[PDB]
Coordinates of C-alpha atoms in Angstrom, one line a residue:
Chain A
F1 CA 141.6 79.7 57.5
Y2 CA 138.9 77.4 57.3
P3 CA 135.3 79.1 58.3
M4 CA 132.2 76.7 57.3
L5 CA 129.3 78.5 55.6
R6 CA 125.9 77.8 56.5
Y7 CA 122.3 79.4 55.0
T8 CA 120.2 79.7 58.0
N9 CA 117.7 81.5 56.5
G10 CA 116.5 81.2 52.7
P11 CA 118.7 81.6 49.6
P12 CA 121.0 85.0 49.3
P13 CA 120.1 87.5 46.9
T14 CA 120.3 86.4 43.1
Chain B
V1 CA 133.3 78.3 3.5
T2 CA 136.5 76.2 3.8
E3 CA 137.8 74.6 7.2
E4 CA 140.8 77.3 7.1
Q5 CA 138.2 79.7 7.0
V6 CA 136.3 78.2 10.0
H7 CA 139.3 77.7 11.9
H8 CA 140.2 81.6 11.6
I9 CA 136.7 82.3 12.7
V10 CA 136.7 80.7 15.6
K11 CA 140.2 81.7 16.7
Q12 CA 139.1 85.2 16.3
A13 CA 135.8 84.3 18.3
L14 CA 137.5 82.7 20.9
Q15 CA 140.2 85.6 21.0
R16 CA 137.2 88.2 21.6
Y17 CA 136.1 86.1 24.2
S18 CA 139.2 86.2 26.4
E19 CA 139.3 89.7 26.2
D20 CA 136.8 90.4 28.8
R21 CA 134.5 89.1 26.3
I22 CA 133.6 92.4 25.0
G23 CA 137.1 93.7 24.0
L24 CA 137.1 97.0 25.6
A25 CA 139.4 98.3 28.7
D26 CA 137.1 99.0 31.6
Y27 CA 137.8 102.1 33.6
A28 CA 135.4 100.7 36.4
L29 CA 137.5 97.1 37.0
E30 CA 138.4 97.3 40.6
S31 CA 141.8 95.4 40.2
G32 CA 142.8 98.1 37.6
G33 CA 142.3 100.9 40.1
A34 CA 138.7 101.4 40.4
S35 CA 137.1 101.8 43.7
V36 CA 133.7 102.4 45.3
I37 CA 132.8 105.6 47.4
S38 CA 130.5 104.1 49.6
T39 CA 129.2 106.9 51.7
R40 CA 127.9 108.4 48.4
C41 CA 126.0 105.1 47.4
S42 CA 123.1 103.0 48.5
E43 CA 122.6 101.0 51.4
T44 CA 122.7 97.0 51.0
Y45 CA 119.9 94.9 51.1
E46 CA 120.0 93.3 54.5
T47 CA 119.0 89.5 54.5
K48 CA 120.7 87.5 57.5
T49 CA 120.9 84.4 55.8
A50 CA 124.5 83.7 55.4
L51 CA 126.2 82.8 58.7
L52 CA 129.8 82.2 58.5
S53 CA 131.9 80.8 61.7
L54 CA 135.0 79.4 62.6
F55 CA 136.5 76.8 65.0
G56 CA 132.9 76.1 66.5
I57 CA 131.4 79.4 67.3
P58 CA 129.0 81.8 65.3
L59 CA 130.7 84.8 63.6
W60 CA 128.7 87.1 61.4
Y61 CA 126.3 87.0 58.6
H62 CA 128.2 88.1 55.3
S63 CA 126.5 90.1 52.8
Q64 CA 127.8 91.1 49.7
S65 CA 129.2 94.7 49.4
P66 CA 129.2 97.1 46.8
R67 CA 132.4 96.6 45.4
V68 CA 131.2 93.2 43.7
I69 CA 129.9 95.4 40.9
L70 CA 133.4 95.9 39.9
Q71 CA 134.5 92.5 40.2
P72 CA 134.5 90.0 37.1
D73 CA 133.3 87.2 39.3
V74 CA 129.7 86.8 37.9
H75 CA 128.2 83.3 39.0
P76 CA 124.7 83.3 40.8
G77 CA 124.7 85.4 43.8
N78 CA 127.8 87.6 43.0
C79 CA 125.7 90.7 42.8
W80 CA 125.2 93.5 44.9
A81 CA 121.6 94.1 46.4
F82 CA 119.4 96.9 47.4
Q83 CA 116.1 97.6 48.7
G84 CA 113.3 98.0 46.2
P85 CA 113.8 99.4 42.6
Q86 CA 115.7 102.2 42.8
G87 CA 119.5 102.5 44.0
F88 CA 122.7 104.6 44.1
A89 CA 126.1 103.7 43.4
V90 CA 129.3 105.7 42.8
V91 CA 132.5 104.6 41.2
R92 CA 136.1 106.4 41.1
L93 CA 137.3 105.4 38.0
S94 CA 141.3 103.8 37.7
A95 CA 141.6 107.0 35.4
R96 CA 140.0 110.4 34.1
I97 CA 138.3 109.5 30.9
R98 CA 135.8 110.8 28.6
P99 CA 133.2 107.8 29.0
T100 CA 132.1 106.6 25.6
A101 CA 129.9 103.8 26.7
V102 CA 128.8 101.6 29.8
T103 CA 128.6 97.9 30.1
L104 CA 125.8 96.3 32.6
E105 CA 125.7 92.5 32.9
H106 CA 123.5 90.1 34.9
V107 CA 123.1 86.4 35.3
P108 CA 121.9 84.2 32.7
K109 CA 118.1 83.4 32.5
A110 CA 119.0 79.9 31.6
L111 CA 120.9 79.7 35.1
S112 CA 118.1 81.1 37.2
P113 CA 115.3 79.2 38.8
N114 CA 112.4 79.1 36.2
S115 CA 114.3 80.7 34.0
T116 CA 113.4 84.1 35.3
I117 CA 115.4 86.9 36.5
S118 CA 112.8 89.7 38.1
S119 CA 116.1 91.2 40.0
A120 CA 117.5 92.6 37.1
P121 CA 117.8 96.0 36.6
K122 CA 115.7 97.7 33.8
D123 CA 115.8 101.2 33.3
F124 CA 118.9 102.9 34.5
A125 CA 121.2 106.5 33.9
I126 CA 124.6 107.5 34.0
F127 CA 125.9 110.7 35.8
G128 CA 129.4 111.8 35.6
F129 CA 131.0 114.4 38.1
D130 CA 134.2 115.9 37.8
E131 CA 135.4 117.0 41.4
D132 CA 133.7 114.0 43.6
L133 CA 131.0 114.3 46.0
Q134 CA 127.4 115.7 45.5
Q135 CA 126.4 119.1 43.4
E136 CA 124.9 116.5 41.2
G137 CA 126.7 115.8 38.1
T138 CA 125.9 115.6 34.4
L139 CA 123.5 113.1 32.9
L140 CA 125.4 111.2 30.5
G141 CA 122.5 108.6 29.3
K142 CA 119.6 107.0 30.2
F143 CA 119.4 103.4 29.1
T144 CA 117.4 100.0 29.6
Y145 CA 118.6 96.8 30.4
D146 CA 117.1 94.1 28.3
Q147 CA 116.0 91.1 30.4
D148 CA 115.4 89.3 27.0
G149 CA 118.5 90.3 25.5
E150 CA 121.8 88.6 26.1
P151 CA 123.4 88.6 29.9
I152 CA 126.2 91.2 28.9
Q153 CA 125.0 94.4 27.4
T154 CA 127.0 97.2 26.0
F155 CA 125.2 100.6 25.6
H156 CA 127.2 103.4 23.9
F157 CA 126.4 106.9 25.0
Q158 CA 124.4 108.8 21.8
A159 CA 126.8 111.6 21.1
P160 CA 128.7 112.2 24.1
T161 CA 130.1 115.5 24.9
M162 CA 133.7 116.2 25.2
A163 CA 134.2 116.6 29.0
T164 CA 136.2 114.2 30.7
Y165 CA 135.5 112.2 34.4
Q166 CA 136.8 110.0 37.0
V167 CA 133.6 109.7 39.2
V168 CA 130.5 108.5 38.0
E169 CA 127.0 107.2 39.1
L170 CA 125.1 104.1 38.4
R171 CA 121.5 105.2 39.4
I172 CA 118.8 102.2 38.8
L173 CA 115.3 103.8 38.2
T174 CA 113.3 100.5 38.1
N175 CA 113.9 97.0 37.9
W176 CA 112.4 93.8 36.1
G177 CA 109.8 93.4 39.2
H178 CA 111.3 91.5 42.2
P179 CA 109.3 92.7 45.2
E180 CA 112.1 93.1 47.6
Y181 CA 115.3 94.1 45.8
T182 CA 117.8 94.4 43.0
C183 CA 121.1 92.7 42.5
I184 CA 123.6 94.0 40.2
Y185 CA 126.4 91.8 39.2
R186 CA 129.3 93.9 37.4
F187 CA 129.1 97.4 35.9
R188 CA 131.9 98.5 33.3
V189 CA 133.0 101.9 32.1
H190 CA 134.8 102.7 28.8
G191 CA 136.0 105.8 27.1
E192 CA 139.0 107.6 25.9
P193 CA 141.6 108.1 28.3
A194 CA 142.9 111.8 29.2
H195 CA 146.3 110.3 28.3
Chain C
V1 CA 132.1 72.2 4.6
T2 CA 129.4 70.7 6.5
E3 CA 127.5 72.1 9.3
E4 CA 128.4 69.1 10.8
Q5 CA 132.1 69.7 10.5
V6 CA 131.7 73.1 11.9
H7 CA 130.3 71.8 15.0
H8 CA 133.3 69.4 15.7
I9 CA 135.5 71.9 14.8
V10 CA 133.9 74.5 17.5
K11 CA 133.4 71.5 20.0
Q12 CA 137.2 70.6 19.6
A13 CA 138.2 74.2 19.9
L14 CA 136.2 75.0 23.0
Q15 CA 137.8 71.8 24.8
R16 CA 140.9 73.0 24.2
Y17 CA 140.0 76.3 25.4
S18 CA 139.0 75.2 28.6
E19 CA 141.9 72.9 29.2
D20 CA 143.9 76.2 30.7
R21 CA 143.8 77.3 27.1
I22 CA 147.2 75.7 25.6
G23 CA 146.2 72.3 27.1
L24 CA 149.6 71.4 28.6
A25 CA 150.1 70.8 32.4
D26 CA 151.8 73.2 34.4
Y27 CA 154.0 72.5 36.9
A28 CA 154.4 75.8 38.0
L29 CA 150.7 76.4 39.1
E30 CA 150.5 77.2 42.5
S31 CA 147.3 75.2 43.4
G32 CA 148.7 72.3 42.0
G33 CA 151.5 72.3 44.5
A34 CA 154.3 75.0 43.1
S35 CA 155.4 77.7 45.1
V36 CA 157.2 80.8 45.2
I37 CA 160.7 81.1 47.2
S38 CA 160.8 84.9 47.8
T39 CA 164.2 85.2 50.0
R40 CA 165.7 84.3 46.4
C41 CA 163.7 86.4 44.0
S42 CA 163.3 90.3 43.3
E43 CA 161.9 93.0 45.5
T44 CA 158.1 94.1 44.6
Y45 CA 157.7 97.6 43.6
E46 CA 156.4 99.6 46.2
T47 CA 153.5 101.9 45.2
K48 CA 151.5 103.3 48.4
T49 CA 148.0 103.4 46.7
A50 CA 145.6 101.0 47.5
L51 CA 144.8 101.3 50.9
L52 CA 142.4 98.5 52.5
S53 CA 140.2 99.1 56.1
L54 CA 137.6 97.6 58.1
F55 CA 135.1 99.0 60.4
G56 CA 136.2 102.5 59.8
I57 CA 140.3 102.5 60.7
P58 CA 142.9 102.3 57.9
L59 CA 145.0 99.2 58.0
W60 CA 147.6 98.7 55.4
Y61 CA 148.4 99.2 51.8
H62 CA 148.1 96.0 50.1
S63 CA 150.3 95.2 46.7
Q64 CA 150.5 91.9 44.7
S65 CA 152.9 89.5 46.0
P66 CA 155.4 87.4 43.9
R67 CA 152.9 84.6 44.1
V68 CA 150.3 86.1 41.9
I69 CA 152.8 85.0 38.9
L70 CA 151.7 81.2 39.2
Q71 CA 147.9 82.1 39.7
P72 CA 145.3 82.0 37.3
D73 CA 143.7 85.0 37.7
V74 CA 144.8 87.4 34.9
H75 CA 142.4 90.5 34.9
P76 CA 144.3 93.7 34.7
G77 CA 146.1 94.2 37.6
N78 CA 146.6 90.8 38.7
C79 CA 150.4 90.9 38.0
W80 CA 153.4 91.2 39.9
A81 CA 155.4 94.1 39.5
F82 CA 159.4 94.8 40.2
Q83 CA 161.3 98.1 40.0
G84 CA 162.9 98.6 36.6
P85 CA 163.3 96.6 33.7
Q86 CA 165.1 93.4 35.1
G87 CA 164.2 91.1 37.6
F88 CA 164.3 87.9 39.6
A89 CA 161.6 85.3 40.2
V90 CA 162.3 81.7 41.7
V91 CA 159.8 78.6 41.7
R92 CA 160.0 75.4 43.5
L93 CA 157.6 73.4 41.1
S94 CA 155.4 71.0 42.1
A95 CA 157.3 68.3 41.1
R96 CA 160.5 67.1 39.5
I97 CA 160.5 67.4 36.0
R98 CA 162.7 67.3 32.8
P99 CA 161.4 71.1 31.6
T100 CA 160.4 71.5 28.0
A101 CA 158.7 74.6 27.5
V102 CA 157.4 77.5 29.4
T103 CA 154.5 80.0 29.1
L104 CA 154.3 83.6 29.9
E105 CA 151.7 86.1 29.4
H106 CA 150.5 89.4 29.9
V107 CA 146.9 91.2 29.9
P108 CA 145.8 91.8 26.1
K109 CA 146.7 95.1 24.6
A110 CA 142.8 95.8 23.8
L111 CA 142.1 95.4 27.5
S112 CA 145.0 98.1 28.2
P113 CA 144.6 102.3 28.2
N114 CA 146.0 103.5 24.8
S115 CA 146.1 100.0 23.7
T116 CA 149.7 99.7 24.7
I117 CA 151.4 97.5 27.3
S118 CA 154.7 98.9 28.2
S119 CA 155.1 97.1 31.2
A120 CA 155.1 93.8 29.8
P121 CA 158.7 92.0 29.8
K122 CA 160.6 91.4 26.6
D123 CA 164.0 89.5 26.6
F124 CA 163.7 86.8 29.2
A125 CA 166.0 83.6 30.3
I126 CA 165.2 80.2 32.3
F127 CA 167.7 78.8 34.6
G128 CA 167.4 75.5 36.4
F129 CA 168.4 74.6 39.7
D130 CA 168.8 71.1 40.8
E131 CA 169.3 71.4 44.8
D132 CA 167.9 75.1 45.2
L133 CA 169.6 78.1 46.6
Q134 CA 172.2 79.9 44.4
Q135 CA 175.4 78.1 43.0
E136 CA 173.8 79.8 39.8
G137 CA 172.0 77.4 37.8
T138 CA 171.9 75.7 34.3
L139 CA 170.5 78.4 31.5
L140 CA 167.6 76.4 29.9
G141 CA 166.5 79.2 27.1
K142 CA 166.8 82.8 26.5
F143 CA 163.4 83.9 25.0
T144 CA 161.6 87.1 23.9
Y145 CA 157.6 88.2 24.9
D146 CA 156.4 89.4 21.5
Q147 CA 153.8 92.7 22.7
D148 CA 152.6 92.5 19.1
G149 CA 152.1 88.9 19.6
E150 CA 149.1 87.0 21.4
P151 CA 148.8 87.4 25.0
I152 CA 149.5 84.0 25.8
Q153 CA 153.0 82.9 24.4
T154 CA 154.4 79.4 24.4
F155 CA 158.1 79.0 24.3
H156 CA 159.6 75.3 23.2
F157 CA 163.2 75.2 24.7
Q158 CA 165.3 74.6 21.0
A159 CA 167.3 70.9 22.1
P160 CA 166.8 70.8 26.0
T161 CA 168.9 68.4 27.7
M162 CA 167.7 65.4 29.8
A163 CA 168.7 66.8 33.0
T164 CA 165.6 67.1 35.5
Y165 CA 164.9 70.0 38.0
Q166 CA 162.3 71.2 40.7
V167 CA 163.7 74.6 41.2
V168 CA 163.4 77.4 38.3
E169 CA 164.5 80.9 38.0
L170 CA 162.6 83.3 35.6
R171 CA 165.1 86.5 34.8
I172 CA 163.4 89.3 33.2
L173 CA 166.1 91.2 31.4
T174 CA 164.4 93.9 29.9
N175 CA 161.0 95.3 29.3
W176 CA 158.8 96.8 26.6
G177 CA 159.6 100.0 27.7
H178 CA 157.7 101.2 31.0
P179 CA 159.9 103.7 33.0
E180 CA 159.0 102.8 36.4
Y181 CA 158.1 98.9 36.9
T182 CA 157.4 95.8 35.1
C183 CA 154.1 93.8 35.7
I184 CA 154.2 89.8 35.5
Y185 CA 150.8 87.9 35.0
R186 CA 151.5 84.5 35.0
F187 CA 154.4 82.1 34.1
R188 CA 153.8 78.5 33.3
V189 CA 156.4 75.5 33.4
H190 CA 155.9 72.4 31.3
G191 CA 157.9 69.4 30.7
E192 CA 157.8 65.5 31.3
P193 CA 157.7 64.3 35.0
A194 CA 160.4 62.2 36.6
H195 CA 157.6 59.6 37.0
Chain D
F1 CA 134.9 89.8 56.5
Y2 CA 133.9 93.3 55.1
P3 CA 137.0 95.6 54.1
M4 CA 136.3 98.2 51.9
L5 CA 139.2 99.2 49.2
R6 CA 140.4 102.8 48.2
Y7 CA 143.2 103.8 46.0
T8 CA 144.5 107.1 47.7
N9 CA 147.4 107.6 45.0
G10 CA 147.1 106.4 41.4
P11 CA 146.4 103.2 39.4
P12 CA 148.0 100.1 40.6
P13 CA 151.0 98.2 38.4
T14 CA 149.4 97.0 35.3
Chain E
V1 CA 127.8 76.1 4.8
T2 CA 128.2 79.9 4.8
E3 CA 130.3 82.1 6.6
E4 CA 127.1 83.9 8.2
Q5 CA 125.7 80.4 9.2
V6 CA 129.6 79.8 10.9
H7 CA 129.2 82.9 13.1
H8 CA 125.8 82.1 14.5
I9 CA 127.1 78.4 15.2
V10 CA 130.2 79.8 17.1
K11 CA 127.8 82.7 19.0
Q12 CA 125.5 79.9 20.0
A13 CA 128.3 77.9 21.0
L14 CA 130.3 80.7 23.0
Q15 CA 126.9 81.6 24.7
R16 CA 126.2 77.9 25.8
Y17 CA 129.6 77.9 27.1
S18 CA 129.2 81.2 29.4
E19 CA 126.4 79.7 31.2
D20 CA 128.1 77.7 33.4
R21 CA 129.4 75.5 30.3
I22 CA 126.2 73.0 30.6
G23 CA 123.2 75.8 30.8
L24 CA 121.4 74.0 33.6
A25 CA 120.8 76.1 36.9
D26 CA 122.7 74.5 39.8
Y27 CA 120.6 74.2 42.9
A28 CA 124.1 73.2 44.9
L29 CA 125.9 76.1 43.8
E30 CA 127.2 77.4 47.1
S31 CA 127.3 81.5 46.0
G32 CA 123.7 80.4 44.9
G33 CA 122.7 79.3 48.4
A34 CA 124.0 76.0 48.6
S35 CA 126.0 74.8 51.6
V36 CA 127.8 71.6 53.0
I37 CA 126.8 70.1 56.2
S38 CA 130.1 68.8 57.6
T39 CA 128.9 66.9 60.5
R40 CA 127.3 64.5 58.1
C41 CA 130.0 63.8 55.4
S42 CA 133.2 62.2 55.3
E43 CA 136.6 63.1 56.8
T44 CA 139.2 65.4 54.8
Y45 CA 142.5 63.4 53.6
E46 CA 144.8 65.1 56.2
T47 CA 148.2 65.7 54.1
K48 CA 150.7 68.3 56.2
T49 CA 152.2 69.4 53.1
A50 CA 151.0 73.4 52.4
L51 CA 152.1 75.4 55.2
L52 CA 150.7 79.1 54.9
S53 CA 152.7 81.9 57.5
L54 CA 152.4 85.5 57.5
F55 CA 155.0 88.3 58.8
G56 CA 157.7 85.3 59.6
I57 CA 156.1 83.1 61.6
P58 CA 154.4 79.6 60.8
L59 CA 150.8 79.4 61.1
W60 CA 149.0 76.0 59.9
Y61 CA 148.7 73.9 57.3
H62 CA 145.8 74.6 55.0
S63 CA 143.9 71.8 53.3
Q64 CA 141.0 72.3 50.9
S65 CA 137.7 71.7 52.9
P66 CA 134.4 70.1 51.5
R67 CA 132.8 73.3 50.3
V68 CA 135.0 73.3 47.2
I69 CA 133.0 70.8 45.9
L70 CA 130.3 73.4 45.3
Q71 CA 132.6 76.0 44.1
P72 CA 133.2 77.1 40.4
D73 CA 137.0 77.3 40.4
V74 CA 138.6 73.8 39.1
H75 CA 142.1 74.4 38.2
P76 CA 144.1 71.4 39.6
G77 CA 144.0 71.1 43.1
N78 CA 140.8 72.9 43.9
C79 CA 139.2 69.8 44.9
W80 CA 138.2 68.3 48.1
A81 CA 139.9 64.8 49.2
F82 CA 139.1 61.7 51.3
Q83 CA 140.8 58.9 52.7
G84 CA 140.5 55.8 50.2
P85 CA 138.1 54.9 47.5
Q86 CA 134.7 55.4 49.5
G87 CA 133.4 58.9 50.7
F88 CA 130.3 60.9 52.2
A89 CA 129.1 64.0 51.2
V90 CA 125.8 65.8 52.3
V91 CA 124.7 69.3 50.6
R92 CA 121.5 71.3 51.9
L93 CA 120.1 72.9 48.4
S94 CA 119.8 76.7 47.6
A95 CA 116.2 75.9 47.2
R96 CA 113.9 72.6 47.3
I97 CA 113.6 71.0 44.1
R98 CA 112.8 67.8 42.1
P99 CA 116.2 66.9 41.2
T100 CA 116.2 65.7 37.7
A101 CA 119.9 65.3 36.9
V102 CA 123.6 65.9 38.5
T103 CA 126.6 67.0 37.3
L104 CA 130.1 65.7 38.4
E105 CA 133.6 66.9 37.1
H106 CA 137.1 66.5 37.2
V107 CA 140.3 68.1 36.0
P108 CA 141.3 67.3 32.6
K109 CA 143.5 64.7 31.7
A110 CA 145.5 66.8 29.3
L111 CA 146.3 69.0 32.7
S112 CA 147.0 66.2 34.7
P113 CA 151.0 64.6 35.1
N114 CA 151.3 61.5 32.9
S115 CA 147.9 62.3 31.4
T116 CA 146.2 60.0 34.2
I117 CA 143.7 61.0 36.7
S118 CA 143.6 57.9 38.9
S119 CA 141.9 60.1 41.9
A120 CA 138.7 60.7 39.9
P121 CA 135.7 59.1 41.6
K122 CA 134.3 55.9 39.4
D123 CA 130.9 54.5 40.5
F124 CA 128.9 56.8 42.6
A125 CA 125.1 57.1 44.1
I126 CA 122.8 59.9 44.8
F127 CA 120.6 59.7 47.9
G128 CA 118.0 62.3 48.5
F129 CA 116.8 63.4 52.1
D130 CA 113.3 65.2 52.9
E131 CA 114.2 66.2 56.5
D132 CA 117.7 66.4 56.7
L133 CA 119.9 64.1 59.3
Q134 CA 120.0 60.4 59.0
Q135 CA 117.4 58.0 58.6
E136 CA 118.8 57.1 55.2
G137 CA 117.1 59.1 52.2
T138 CA 115.9 57.8 49.1
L139 CA 118.1 56.2 46.2
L140 CA 117.8 58.4 43.3
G141 CA 120.4 57.1 41.2
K142 CA 123.8 55.0 40.7
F143 CA 126.4 56.3 37.9
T144 CA 129.7 56.2 37.2
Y145 CA 132.1 59.2 36.1
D146 CA 133.5 58.0 32.7
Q147 CA 137.6 58.7 33.3
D148 CA 137.8 58.5 29.2
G149 CA 134.7 60.7 28.6
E150 CA 134.9 64.4 28.9
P151 CA 135.9 66.6 32.2
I152 CA 132.1 67.9 32.9
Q153 CA 129.7 64.7 32.8
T154 CA 125.8 65.1 33.4
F155 CA 123.7 62.5 34.5
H156 CA 120.2 62.5 33.8
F157 CA 118.2 60.3 36.4
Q158 CA 116.3 57.4 34.4
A159 CA 113.0 58.1 35.0
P160 CA 112.9 60.1 38.7
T161 CA 110.3 60.4 41.1
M162 CA 108.1 63.4 41.5
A163 CA 109.0 63.6 45.3
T164 CA 111.0 67.0 46.2
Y165 CA 113.9 67.6 48.1
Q166 CA 116.5 70.0 49.6
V167 CA 119.3 67.9 51.1
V168 CA 121.2 65.3 49.3
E169 CA 124.0 62.7 49.1
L170 CA 126.9 62.3 46.8
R171 CA 128.1 58.8 48.0
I172 CA 131.6 57.8 46.3
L173 CA 131.6 54.1 46.1
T174 CA 135.2 53.6 44.0
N175 CA 137.5 55.4 42.2
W176 CA 140.0 55.1 39.2
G177 CA 142.5 53.7 41.3
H178 CA 144.7 56.1 43.4
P179 CA 146.0 54.4 46.3
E180 CA 145.7 56.9 49.3
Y181 CA 142.8 59.2 48.0
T182 CA 140.0 60.7 45.9
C183 CA 139.8 64.1 44.9
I184 CA 136.1 66.1 44.0
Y185 CA 136.4 68.9 41.8
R186 CA 132.6 70.3 41.3
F187 CA 129.5 68.7 42.2
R188 CA 126.0 70.3 40.6
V189 CA 122.7 69.7 41.1
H190 CA 119.6 70.1 38.7
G191 CA 115.9 69.9 39.0
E192 CA 112.7 71.7 38.5
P193 CA 112.1 74.0 41.4
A194 CA 109.3 73.5 44.0
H195 CA 108.1 77.0 43.0
Chain F
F1 CA 147.1 90.6 54.4
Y2 CA 150.3 89.2 53.0
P3 CA 150.7 85.3 53.9
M4 CA 153.5 83.2 52.1
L5 CA 152.9 79.7 50.9
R6 CA 154.7 76.9 50.9
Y7 CA 154.5 73.0 50.4
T8 CA 157.0 71.5 52.8
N9 CA 156.1 68.0 51.8
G10 CA 155.0 66.9 48.6
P11 CA 152.6 68.1 46.0
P12 CA 148.8 68.7 47.3
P13 CA 145.7 66.3 46.6
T14 CA 144.9 66.4 42.6

């Protein structure tokens, strides 16, 4: 599998 | 001290480090057999930031599920989030045990922007259930995660009762002041097995 | 000793720690190019405990495959299990090498319920093959995993022969007394490359 | 992907 | 020194170790919110070695994608490769920050066959963009990964400008002499947040 | 999921 990742909005929760 | 003594201190030190850092078995570790229940236990904070896609076309926004709180991986973001400062989470432990202590941990301050960690849980409490689902469970302890302490914090129940359990609740009552959510990195449960 | 000496001891110590703990290349590491053969090598202990499901409906019971014995992850449960105390496992190494030593490791006692690890392999042996598939391979060494030793244990072949290999067998002959199975966490192969 | 995990029977092998 | 002093040295040492090793936040960490752009940034070295398949039938050859350069996992093979000694990679950071330093790391020599690491990047440079896509970005620093130094290497910009950025380029200009490719294990970006 | 892995050609990039 080769899925690309992108954060359209802000950062994720941390 | 002598060099020989130093090496022994280090060896011992490194050894404890490699025993999941704290050297106690974790009856809440997922790979060891623990699992989260979901139907019982809070709704995940919805964000819609992280869009994963393959071969060209958009698929879905992924968001960390509750089970990551039982997963060893604790780099920034490897946490489960929920709306506001209070929240439910319920584990079926890998075995029925007398719960003696719990461990909560958050990402280090030093690894956090502005070296603040405002989404860290503050006051929490542990309920133990002995049948699963609801009736409301025995309070086992009400603790406080210190944001100025170390990242991994172990809390030993002040004189626990001898009753055994396999289901338990982590209930977060407040956090350290983030407005939108609360991230929980890893939650551990220790105790003497029913053997 | 002086403080300066201590820091150097620690630095050196931490450095070795971060070199896969033992500081030797692992020609059996999967991501490095090693793989398991499967058709040759034992049947996985069937359990039917871990039921994974998505969007509502049951899918299948997952159970750890043989390849996890070549994977670095060694938290509790990150092992491959097989029926009883004796078992086959066969690796194609990432390169043809003169096998000088092997490394076996199990989960720490301190992280195991009752601080016993009865499903740990006891006596084992290593066969090396130079063509893959069957004819029966050269014995390279017959060792014993010490359940009272440290978790990672390196075994240096007593005067190995100069012949090179790319396929090898891990053969577990007994374990430390678990009735049902044997879990194998990580198996490493070291040697001088054919260059 | 978001698959839930549950152990219907005992613990897994360890 | 006294034993007491030693323990403190070790504790402190182990603590820094567990803070992603270097103790600085990484605005390029993927789980923290960083992502790679792909359309901008080099073509992956095609190999056709690793054939993954399920239920009997061949599926595809997997090959490490650019995003692994933002992933903490750095065992052998956990790198992204590209054709020859020069290459593009472009990150959208998890936040707009004033870039103060970067960190590059490769697998340890001691864990590499023949204890050489010829596919390690040599000279590199960092460009910062303030709008994404192309116009060509501000040079922020031109460094050199030392193959004879430690595996993790932090490079502090010699007097950086106060301008802030969220997109940045890692541009590899040469490597340490591998003929076919260049593997990049993990790339980190540190700076003061725009707050 | 249970996918088997095999390296038909050489080692992967390192």
